[PDB]
C-alpha cells in the first residue's frame, strides 16, 4: 500500500566512508579492502580547479600528503595511483567493515541510491536515476564529492557512482568507481553543459503500472495504440523512444495488472496531449520517470 | 545544489531490527537493550483481527510462543508485557548494536525517516511527515508492521513511530514507541477513516525558501500580505493556519534569503489562487509540505 521514492538501506556503505584531505581541500573517500577511492581533484587548490594538469599536480604529492581519517582514527597511506578521474590510496589496514561488493557502470534509465556525505560522515540517503543525458538530480554541497551511488542485490553492494561536480543547470555529474565519467563531462571548471534532459519512457510506464496496482486508475482510457504511433507523439514531448525490449521488460507488470503495455501507452499519450487537469497520480502532478520496472516490482512485492 | 527528499542514514537502526513470529503471524520488532518492541497484533490470527480482545488473547500466550530471530540466530524470550498497543518481549541478551536512543512522540508537521522492513530485514528507507490528521503517506505491505520511524541528532536515534495499519485511503497509521497511536485510530479491522488531510503551511513556506536558495525564484512577486489576510485565503485551500511561532521558525530562512516571511506568504497566496501554470518548483508541480524549516536548513548547510 502506497508508493514512495525509496533508497536501499545505507548501513553497509556507511562503514566504508572516510574523510580525505590534501592541502586545504577535504572530501570523502570509499574505503574497501586496503584501498581508498576518492575524486582526484582533492589535490587541486582553489586556483588549480579551472584548468588542472592532474599528472603534473600529482608529481608533487606524496603518500603523506593524503590525510585519510576513518572516524577519529588516522589511516596510514602507503601508496597512491591515479585511475582516470579517481585516486586509489593504498592504506596499511583493510577495512574490517568491507562488504561483499562489485564495481558496475550503469546504463541511462537505471536507478541507484546515493549516500550523501560530508567530512567522511554520512548525511542522508536518497534515490537517483542515471538520466538519458548522463546527469543526476541529487542534493550535493561543497565537500560532498566522493559520496557514492549504489545498489544492493541481497548481500552484495554494487557501487556505480562517485560524485564530482554540479553543472550550470543545477544537475550533477560524476564517475563510475573506475574513474570514468558518465557522459562527456570532465573534472575541470570550464564551460560545459548538460544536453537535452529527455524522459525515461519505460520508467513512466512502470510508474503508471505502480499507480494501478495501488488503486489509482482514473487515467486508464478505452484506447490502445501502436509502438510506432506512440513514439511519434512521445518524441514531440522529448520522451525517449520506446522499444520492444522496453515492452518485454514491462511484461510482468502488464500481466500482474491485466493491462497490455500498448493500452497503457495509449493512456500515457493522452496524458501527454491533455495534461493531468489538476489531478494527481500517486500524489504527483508530474509523470515520474525515476522508477524502473524492477524498482516497481521490488517495492510492490516486499523484496528485502 | 539541488534539493531532494532525503532520509537519515539507516545503519544504526538496521542493527536493531528483528523478526517476531507468534502463531502464523510474522512481523518486525525493535531490539534495544534486552527488550524487543513490536505491535501487539502479532498475537492475532487472521480471524482475531476484526474485534480483538488483546488482554484475553494474551492470556493464552507464553514466553515460548513469541519466536524472535535476529539474523539466523534465535533469541530467548524470558518475559513479556503489553504497553498500550505494543508488546515488550524481554530477552536474555542485550543487543550489542544498541545505539544511544530515545523515545519521543512527535507533533503534526514534524518529519522522520522510515526504515521499511520485512521478516526483520531492512527493505528500504524514505522520509515521512506526521500529517495534521495524524496519518503518514509511506510504503508498507503485509508483514511491514513493526518498522519504525526515527530522527538522528548526531549520535542519538530518536524513535517516534512504529507501523501498525493502512487506512481505506491508502495512508498509514501507527504508534509511538510507548504504544500510543497517533490520531484516533485503534489496532482493529473495523470501519475507521482518516480525517481532512490539511496542508502544513509552514513547511510549504520552508520549501519555497529552499527553492529560492537553489536559484528557482520565478514565483516571487512584488506583493506582501498580512498573517490574517493570508490565512483567510490559505484556509479556503485547507492549509493549516499560519501563526507567529511559525513565522518565528522561518526567521533564519527569511534572513538567509532577504525575503520577509510575509512577502513569501504573498507569493504562496498567488500560487494557490492561480496555480503553477504548468511550471515547476524544485522539480515539483505541487506545493510540497513534507520539509520542515529544520529540514531545509539541514540539507542546505551540510549537517552530518
Ligand atoms: C565536490 O564536492 C564539488 C561538488 C559541487 C559543489 C557544490 N555542489 C556540487 O555538486 N565539486 C566541485 O566543486 C567541482 C570541482 C572541479 C574539479 C570539477 N566544480 C564544480 O562543480 O563547479 C561548479 C560549482 C562549484 C561550486 C559551487 C557551485 C558550482
Ligand atoms: C501490519 O504489517 C499490517 C500493515 C498493512 C497491511 C498492508 N499495508 C499496511 O500498511 N497491518 C494490518 O494488516 C492491520 C492489522 C490490524 C490489527 C489493524 N490491518 C489493516 O491495516 O487492515 C487494512 C488492510 C489489511 C490488508 C491489506 C489492505 C488493507
XYZ file of C-alpha atoms and ligand atoms in Angstrom:
666
model
C 0.000 0.000 0.000
C 1.397 3.354 -1.074
C 4.367 4.040 -3.315
C 7.392 6.152 -2.410
C 10.797 7.012 -3.809
C 12.839 4.708 -1.611
C 16.553 4.099 -1.120
C 18.385 0.942 -0.173
C 19.385 0.713 3.495
C 22.703 2.521 3.810
C 24.375 0.593 6.637
C 26.814 -1.433 4.543
C 28.046 1.755 2.839
C 28.232 3.954 5.951
C 31.056 1.744 7.226
C 33.090 2.388 4.057
C 33.077 6.203 4.163
C 36.207 8.101 5.211
C 37.469 11.677 5.020
C 40.296 12.521 2.607
C 42.228 15.791 2.908
C 45.034 17.011 0.653
C 46.349 20.504 1.256
C 43.304 22.647 2.026
C 40.727 20.510 0.169
C 38.600 17.963 2.045
C 36.149 15.448 0.598
C 35.028 11.837 1.004
C 36.619 8.548 0.071
C 35.359 4.980 -0.203
C 37.378 2.502 1.874
C 37.156 -1.064 0.538
C 39.770 -3.660 1.485
C 43.094 -1.759 1.763
C 42.230 0.907 -0.835
C 40.531 4.298 -0.535
C 38.828 5.699 -3.640
C 38.244 9.433 -3.999
C 37.967 12.070 -6.741
C 41.347 13.217 -7.980
C 40.532 16.910 -7.675
C 41.277 16.570 -3.936
C 44.805 17.573 -4.993
C 43.654 20.830 -6.607
C 43.763 24.140 -4.812
C 41.014 26.691 -5.383
C 43.089 28.086 -8.264
C 44.092 24.775 -9.872
C 40.486 23.711 -10.458
C 39.966 25.756 -13.653
C 42.479 24.000 -15.948
C 44.267 21.322 -13.919
C 47.070 19.175 -15.269
C 46.448 16.303 -12.879
C 49.545 14.306 -13.835
C 51.684 17.383 -13.168
C 49.844 18.284 -9.966
C 50.284 14.666 -8.849
C 54.084 14.721 -9.174
C 54.312 16.983 -6.120
C 52.030 14.838 -3.925
C 53.497 12.012 -1.844
C 51.753 9.401 0.288
C 51.995 11.614 3.381
C 50.144 14.478 1.660
C 46.884 12.460 1.625
C 45.335 12.624 5.101
C 42.799 9.791 5.418
C 40.641 9.617 8.546
C 38.090 6.940 9.490
C 36.085 8.283 12.389
C 38.564 9.865 14.784
C 41.260 7.422 13.596
C 44.001 8.218 11.074
C 44.888 5.657 8.401
C 48.435 5.281 7.090
C 48.769 5.823 3.326
C 51.394 3.522 1.790
C 50.808 4.082 -1.931
C 48.800 6.057 -4.424
C 47.732 5.840 -8.059
C 45.507 7.739 -10.492
C 42.945 5.731 -12.476
C 41.171 8.097 -14.858
C 39.405 10.658 -12.639
C 39.849 8.927 -9.245
C 42.772 8.320 -6.908
C 43.442 4.959 -5.275
C 45.156 5.437 -1.906
C 46.639 2.186 -0.632
C 46.452 2.068 3.173
C 48.080 -0.329 5.623
C 44.757 -1.575 7.052
C 41.951 -3.432 5.314
C 38.538 -2.023 6.188
C 37.101 -4.587 8.643
C 33.618 -3.458 7.543
C 34.211 -4.162 3.843
C 31.031 -5.767 2.443
C 30.765 -8.107 -0.478
C 30.970 -5.585 -3.295
C 31.294 -5.019 -7.034
C 32.015 -2.070 -9.336
C 29.451 -1.653 -12.118
C 28.833 1.003 -14.746
C 25.085 1.538 -15.085
C 23.125 2.453 -18.208
C 20.875 5.504 -18.592
C 17.452 4.802 -17.111
C 18.758 2.683 -14.239
C 18.446 3.854 -10.642
C 20.681 3.786 -7.576
C 20.875 5.068 -4.003
C 23.136 7.988 -3.074
C 24.637 8.265 0.413
C 25.436 11.968 0.683
C 28.459 12.545 2.909
C 30.497 15.420 4.317
C 33.892 15.091 6.003
C 33.572 11.314 5.760
C 30.310 11.310 7.740
C 27.012 10.149 6.197
C 24.490 12.985 5.933
C 21.480 11.388 4.239
C 20.352 8.948 1.589
C 18.088 9.306 -1.438
C 17.322 7.542 -4.715
C 18.515 8.770 -8.121
C 18.371 7.670 -11.747
C 21.094 7.938 -14.370
C 19.282 10.200 -16.792
C 19.441 9.876 -20.599
C 21.803 12.880 -20.742
C 24.096 11.238 -18.136
C 23.344 13.676 -15.307
C 21.622 13.047 -11.978
C 19.317 15.259 -9.917
C 20.750 14.859 -6.436
C 21.442 17.052 -3.412
C 25.125 17.944 -3.077
C 27.017 20.787 -1.405
C 30.690 21.685 -1.264
C 32.658 18.844 0.285
C 30.148 16.195 -0.854
C 32.418 14.822 -3.582
C 33.383 11.203 -3.082
C 29.865 10.357 -1.961
C 28.830 7.234 -3.844
C 25.789 5.717 -5.505
C 24.982 2.048 -5.086
C 22.505 -0.781 -5.468
C 22.218 -3.848 -3.230
C 21.249 -7.305 -4.522
C 20.777 -9.141 -1.213
C 24.268 -9.239 0.338
C 26.363 -7.562 -2.385
C 26.807 -3.801 -2.777
C 27.211 -2.724 -6.412
C 28.897 0.676 -6.484
C 28.086 2.624 -9.645
C 28.650 6.337 -8.973
C 31.051 8.727 -7.266
C 30.151 12.410 -7.158
C 32.424 15.038 -8.698
C 30.623 18.183 -9.804
C 27.495 20.254 -10.385
C 26.528 21.754 -13.742
C 25.105 25.205 -14.556
C 21.568 23.785 -14.598
C 21.918 22.509 -11.027
C 22.144 18.834 -12.028
C 25.056 16.606 -11.096
C 27.824 14.669 -12.833
C 30.240 12.002 -11.712
C 32.135 8.826 -12.483
C 31.914 5.099 -12.011
C 34.317 3.594 -9.480
C 36.957 3.188 -12.200
C 37.022 6.975 -12.594
C 35.281 7.208 -15.981
C 32.645 9.941 -16.075
C 29.098 9.264 -17.108
C 28.558 11.483 -20.131
C 31.011 13.810 -21.894
C 31.914 15.754 -18.751
C 35.402 16.340 -17.360
C 36.597 17.285 -13.876
C 37.562 20.888 -14.574
C 35.779 24.212 -14.057
C 35.340 25.188 -17.695
C 32.267 25.914 -19.798
C 30.380 22.626 -20.166
C 26.642 21.943 -20.195
C 24.318 19.003 -19.864
C 22.317 18.270 -23.005
C 18.618 17.688 -23.562
C 17.127 16.032 -20.465
C 14.763 13.558 -22.099
C 12.261 11.427 -20.197
C 12.684 7.712 -19.461
C 9.515 6.474 -21.158
C 9.752 2.885 -19.903
C 10.103 4.177 -16.340
C 6.998 6.365 -16.631
C 5.056 3.326 -17.847
C 6.337 1.292 -14.895
C 5.196 4.082 -12.570
C 1.771 4.123 -14.245
C 1.613 0.388 -13.542
C 2.533 1.098 -9.915
C -0.376 3.540 -9.648
C -2.833 0.957 -10.974
C -1.501 -1.624 -8.509
C -2.202 0.894 -5.725
C -5.773 1.581 -6.865
C -5.173 4.875 -8.711
C -6.757 4.142 -12.103
C -8.505 7.368 -13.156
C -6.174 7.815 -16.158
C -6.942 4.492 -17.870
C -8.875 5.114 -21.093
C -10.681 2.926 -23.636
C -7.919 3.187 -26.256
C -4.838 1.317 -27.404
C -2.043 2.338 -29.773
C 0.952 1.004 -31.693
C 4.602 1.372 -30.756
C 5.238 3.438 -33.892
C 2.230 5.725 -33.389
C 3.050 6.188 -29.703
C 6.677 7.147 -30.339
C 5.621 9.751 -32.918
C 3.733 11.551 -30.147
C 6.139 10.709 -27.315
C 9.147 12.260 -29.043
C 7.283 15.507 -29.665
C 7.446 15.579 -25.844
C 11.158 14.694 -25.529
C 10.380 11.171 -24.330
C 12.972 8.509 -25.032
C 11.649 6.239 -27.812
C 10.035 3.038 -26.557
C 11.377 -0.251 -27.925
C 10.250 -3.870 -27.939
C 12.813 -4.642 -25.233
C 11.169 -2.000 -23.039
C 7.830 -3.663 -23.825
C 9.338 -7.010 -22.816
C 10.670 -5.536 -19.567
C 7.175 -4.279 -18.672
C 5.753 -7.731 -19.428
C 5.434 -8.979 -15.851
C 3.895 -5.671 -14.763
C 1.473 -5.951 -17.686
C 0.452 -9.460 -16.624
C 0.111 -8.650 -12.919
C -2.328 -5.876 -13.883
C -4.073 -7.335 -16.932
C -3.290 -4.152 -18.894
C -1.483 -4.596 -22.199
C 1.624 -2.427 -22.476
C 0.229 -0.728 -25.585
C -3.045 0.014 -23.790
C -1.005 1.762 -21.096
C 0.917 3.570 -23.841
C -2.428 4.881 -25.096
C -3.106 6.225 -21.600
C 0.297 7.928 -21.437
C -0.251 9.511 -24.860
C -3.487 11.181 -23.747
C -1.825 12.335 -20.517
C 0.902 13.999 -22.588
C -1.552 15.527 -25.061
C -4.064 16.710 -22.439
C -2.155 17.021 -19.156
C -3.289 15.968 -15.702
C -6.158 18.506 -15.485
C -5.019 19.276 -11.945
C -5.375 15.674 -10.756
C -2.514 13.596 -9.335
C -1.141 10.075 -9.723
C 0.454 8.509 -6.645
C 0.494 12.004 -5.159
C 2.362 13.596 -8.081
C 1.234 16.245 -10.566
C 4.072 15.148 -12.885
C 4.763 11.954 -14.792
C 7.522 10.396 -12.680
C 10.307 8.631 -14.594
C 12.873 7.636 -11.923
C 11.305 4.257 -11.106
C 12.475 1.306 -13.185
C 10.261 -1.724 -13.823
C 12.488 -3.628 -11.385
C 12.053 -0.793 -8.872
C 8.256 -1.067 -9.003
C 8.129 -4.860 -8.685
C 10.589 -4.617 -5.787
C 8.505 -2.140 -3.797
C 5.148 -3.786 -4.603
C 6.378 -7.259 -3.540
C 8.340 -6.656 -0.327
C 11.803 -7.693 -1.507
C 14.384 -7.296 1.261
C 22.974 22.454 -5.057
C 19.697 20.649 -5.651
C 17.065 19.683 -3.109
C 15.736 16.176 -2.511
C 13.512 14.343 -0.064
C 16.249 12.712 1.976
C 16.309 10.213 4.832
C 18.755 9.847 7.679
C 21.360 7.108 7.207
C 19.753 3.892 8.409
C 22.760 1.966 9.732
C 22.148 2.488 13.446
C 18.559 1.241 13.060
C 19.294 -1.716 10.765
C 21.156 -3.365 13.646
C 18.062 -3.136 15.874
C 15.591 -4.906 13.566
C 14.487 -8.472 14.315
C 11.722 -10.811 13.172
C 8.890 -11.650 15.580
C 6.557 -14.589 14.923
C 3.589 -15.677 17.036
C 1.442 -18.485 15.694
C 1.137 -17.870 11.954
C 1.715 -14.086 12.037
C 5.168 -12.631 11.337
C 6.268 -9.004 11.588
C 9.185 -6.872 12.774
C 10.412 -5.902 16.206
C 12.836 -3.294 17.512
C 15.606 -4.760 19.683
C 17.070 -2.215 22.119
C 18.994 -3.356 25.196
C 17.297 -6.597 26.361
C 13.808 -5.679 25.100
C 12.079 -6.247 21.758
C 9.229 -3.898 20.826
C 6.585 -4.975 18.323
C 2.902 -4.350 17.553
C 0.606 -6.391 19.754
C -1.488 -7.688 16.869
C 1.290 -10.249 16.254
C -0.806 -12.431 18.581
C -3.928 -12.170 16.406
C -4.868 -14.795 13.874
C -6.466 -13.767 10.591
C -9.863 -14.074 12.299
C -8.996 -12.302 15.565
C -8.027 -9.067 13.813
C -11.595 -7.746 13.382
C -12.547 -7.276 17.061
C -9.634 -8.468 19.201
C -9.699 -8.576 22.979
C -5.943 -8.285 23.369
C -5.880 -8.889 27.127
C -7.859 -12.097 26.602
C -5.810 -13.171 23.585
C -2.671 -12.500 25.641
C -3.658 -14.871 28.461
C -3.015 -17.851 26.181
C 0.428 -16.662 25.015
C 3.538 -17.605 26.992
C 7.146 -16.528 26.513
C 7.848 -19.518 24.257
C 5.044 -18.550 21.850
C 6.981 -15.443 20.712
C 9.666 -16.541 18.243
C 12.265 -13.760 17.982
C 15.038 -14.094 15.400
C 17.988 -11.744 14.809
C 19.554 -12.727 11.522
C 19.754 -16.514 11.502
C 20.023 -16.513 15.320
C 17.159 -17.208 17.733
C 16.780 -15.065 20.855
C 15.420 -16.488 24.106
C 12.286 -14.726 25.387
C 12.223 -14.535 29.195
C 9.282 -12.190 29.788
C 6.546 -10.259 28.075
C 4.276 -7.293 28.749
C 1.676 -5.219 26.903
C 2.072 -1.428 26.967
C -0.888 0.105 25.150
C -0.670 -1.181 21.559
C 2.845 -2.711 21.676
C 4.382 -5.776 23.294
C 7.677 -5.680 25.177
C 9.459 -9.037 24.908
C 12.269 -9.321 27.441
C 15.121 -11.397 26.000
C 18.180 -12.860 27.706
C 20.667 -10.925 25.535
C 21.186 -7.185 25.245
C 21.516 -6.056 21.638
C 25.267 -5.397 21.235
C 24.378 -2.925 18.458
C 22.074 -0.812 20.640
C 22.738 2.864 19.809
C 22.249 5.825 22.061
C 18.498 6.223 21.733
C 15.368 7.968 22.983
C 11.605 7.524 22.588
C 9.807 10.698 21.502
C 6.258 11.474 20.434
C 6.363 13.939 17.543
C 3.873 16.688 16.719
C 1.982 17.047 13.431
C 4.161 18.772 10.848
C 7.399 17.151 12.005
C 9.264 14.701 9.785
C 11.094 11.421 10.324
C 12.773 8.597 8.411
C 11.064 5.223 7.971
C 13.105 2.029 7.626
C 10.674 -0.331 5.909
C 11.321 -3.929 6.938
C 10.029 -7.418 6.191
C 10.823 -10.538 8.219
C 13.232 -8.482 10.315
C 15.274 -7.474 7.254
C 15.561 -3.833 6.127
C 13.951 -3.267 2.726
C 14.367 0.467 2.120
C 14.303 3.888 3.713
C 12.312 7.034 2.966
C 11.276 10.281 4.646
C 7.780 10.950 6.009
C 5.932 13.690 7.869
C 3.352 13.304 10.619
C 0.439 14.933 8.851
C -2.114 17.228 10.534
C -4.669 14.383 10.506
C -2.129 12.045 12.186
C -1.580 9.775 9.177
C 1.560 9.236 7.106
C 2.000 8.560 3.390
C 4.502 5.720 3.399
C 5.083 2.479 1.504
C 4.033 -0.582 3.504
C 2.981 -4.116 2.576
C 1.789 -7.058 4.636
C 4.432 -8.013 7.177
C 5.856 -4.470 7.351
C 4.382 -3.752 10.786
C 6.978 -3.066 13.445
C 9.014 -0.998 11.008
C 9.940 2.213 12.795
C 10.332 5.912 12.106
C 13.237 7.853 13.548
C 15.319 11.007 13.581
C 19.034 11.252 14.382
C 20.597 14.219 16.200
C 24.294 13.400 15.751
C 24.818 10.192 17.761
C 21.343 9.652 19.260
C 18.463 7.896 17.493
C 15.051 9.295 18.460
C 12.410 6.683 17.685
C 8.986 8.221 17.090
C 6.883 5.777 15.053
C 6.061 2.085 14.747
C 3.848 0.967 11.878
C 0.555 -0.822 12.513
C -2.003 -0.378 9.754
C -3.216 1.126 6.485
C -6.452 3.087 6.115
C -9.076 2.968 3.340
C -7.491 5.995 1.651
C -4.134 4.219 1.367
C -2.441 6.314 4.070
C -0.831 4.818 7.150
C -1.308 4.868 10.917
C 0.826 3.789 13.831
C 2.037 4.408 17.355
C 4.908 5.952 19.234
C 7.283 3.524 20.940
C 5.098 3.554 24.064
C 2.272 2.041 22.010
C 0.007 5.107 21.844
C -1.390 5.695 18.362
C -1.012 8.981 16.584
C -4.569 10.135 15.974
C -7.855 8.494 16.998
C -7.062 5.154 15.359
C -7.110 1.736 17.019
C -5.460 -1.553 16.058
C -8.552 -3.404 14.870
C -10.065 -4.014 11.430
C -13.252 -2.004 11.852
C -14.673 0.970 9.971
C -12.383 3.927 10.695
C -11.244 6.750 8.419
C -8.603 9.429 8.370
C -9.996 12.957 8.500
C -9.312 16.020 6.385
C -5.696 15.926 5.172
C -4.773 19.587 5.529
C -1.508 21.090 4.303
C 1.425 22.042 6.542
C 1.628 25.723 5.609
C 4.885 26.434 7.452
C 6.519 23.507 5.650
C 5.433 24.771 2.225
C 6.954 28.156 3.068
C 10.196 26.465 4.127
C 10.221 24.595 0.812
C 9.634 27.858 -1.072
C 12.665 29.227 0.774
C 14.628 26.143 -0.297
C 13.736 26.831 -3.935
C 14.971 30.420 -3.692
C 18.218 29.230 -2.097
C 18.671 26.917 -5.101
C 18.065 29.669 -7.665
C 14.422 28.881 -8.517
C 12.769 32.279 -7.996
C 10.185 32.620 -10.784
C 7.287 32.640 -8.285
C 8.420 35.663 -6.249
C 6.049 38.585 -6.844
C 6.022 42.283 -5.927
C 3.441 41.872 -3.145
C 3.283 41.335 0.595
C 0.369 40.412 2.859
C -0.685 40.148 6.499
C -0.944 36.988 8.569
C -4.702 37.492 8.937
C -5.301 38.176 5.235
C -3.113 35.236 4.217
C -4.895 32.757 6.489
C -8.292 33.820 5.119
C -7.144 32.630 1.691
C -4.997 29.722 2.898
C -7.844 28.038 4.768
C -10.110 28.192 1.728
C -7.439 25.787 0.420
C -7.321 23.518 3.502
C -3.957 24.912 4.595
C -3.171 24.792 8.293
C -3.406 28.345 9.692
C -0.060 30.120 9.973
C 0.901 31.513 13.383
C 3.521 33.902 14.721
C 5.501 30.933 16.045
C 5.625 29.543 12.501
C 6.800 32.989 11.369
C 9.478 32.888 14.072
C 10.581 29.410 12.982
C 11.043 30.649 9.398
C 13.075 33.600 10.694
C 16.542 32.255 9.909
C 15.405 31.150 6.448
C 13.944 34.627 5.928
C 17.247 36.258 6.888
C 19.436 33.926 4.823
C 17.349 34.880 1.772
C 16.458 38.509 2.485
C 12.772 37.717 1.871
C 10.349 38.667 4.631
C 8.115 35.780 5.682
C 5.004 37.790 4.796
C 6.417 38.581 1.350
C 6.804 34.835 0.808
C 3.258 34.364 2.113
C 2.109 36.754 -0.617
C 3.854 34.530 -3.167
C 2.193 31.394 -1.785
C -1.225 33.076 -1.880
C -0.931 33.828 -5.601
C 0.310 30.285 -6.257
C -2.806 28.941 -4.532
C -5.145 31.359 -6.308
C -3.576 30.952 -9.766
C -1.781 27.591 -9.764
C 1.623 26.776 -11.205
C 0.624 27.422 -14.853
C 2.442 24.217 -15.770
C 5.772 25.370 -14.322
C 7.644 23.552 -11.546
C 9.459 24.447 -8.330
C 12.420 22.261 -7.369
C 11.147 19.782 -9.948
C 7.627 19.550 -8.491
C 4.282 20.585 -9.973
C 2.811 20.556 -6.441
C 3.443 22.661 -3.362
C 5.484 20.266 -1.217
C 4.761 20.334 2.526
C 6.864 17.483 3.996
C 10.006 19.567 4.574
C 10.261 21.344 7.917
C 12.245 24.564 8.350
C 14.851 22.487 10.199
C 14.847 20.015 7.297
C 15.652 22.753 4.775
C 18.439 24.355 6.816
C 19.899 20.884 7.394
C 20.069 19.983 3.706
C 21.221 23.444 2.557
C 24.075 23.555 5.115
C 25.615 20.068 5.008
C 24.806 18.921 8.542
C 26.047 15.376 9.162
C 32.926 18.371 -4.888
O 32.489 18.197 -3.553
C 32.195 19.528 -5.607
C 30.651 19.350 -5.670
C 29.826 20.599 -6.177
C 29.998 21.839 -5.294
C 28.612 22.342 -4.953
N 27.680 21.301 -5.360
C 28.339 20.249 -6.087
O 27.749 19.263 -6.515
N 32.761 19.741 -6.946
C 33.313 20.891 -7.380
O 33.410 21.909 -6.693
C 33.834 20.877 -8.838
C 35.375 20.725 -8.860
C 36.018 20.567 -10.261
C 37.344 19.778 -10.180
C 35.058 19.949 -11.299
N 33.437 22.073 -9.597
C 32.094 22.361 -9.795
O 31.173 21.553 -9.667
O 31.952 23.658 -10.139
C 30.671 24.284 -10.183
C 30.311 24.861 -8.819
C 31.254 24.893 -7.785
C 30.910 25.425 -6.542
C 29.623 25.923 -6.331
C 28.679 25.895 -7.355
C 29.023 25.363 -8.597
C 0.974 -4.915 9.521
O 2.134 -5.335 8.827
C -0.178 -4.520 8.569
C 0.187 -3.371 7.586
C -0.857 -3.081 6.435
C -1.084 -4.277 5.505
C -0.913 -3.779 4.087
N -0.334 -2.447 4.180
C -0.279 -1.983 5.541
O 0.183 -0.891 5.855
N -1.391 -4.200 9.335
C -2.576 -4.829 9.207
O -2.779 -5.759 8.426
C -3.714 -4.307 10.119
C -3.918 -5.255 11.325
C -4.942 -4.784 12.389
C -4.607 -5.363 13.781
C -5.096 -3.249 12.439
N -4.984 -4.130 9.398
C -5.066 -3.245 8.333
O -4.261 -2.342 8.102
O -6.154 -3.529 7.587
C -6.362 -2.929 6.310
C -5.699 -3.756 5.215
C -5.153 -5.013 5.501
C -4.549 -5.759 4.488
C -4.488 -5.249 3.191
C -5.029 -3.998 2.899
C -5.632 -3.253 3.911
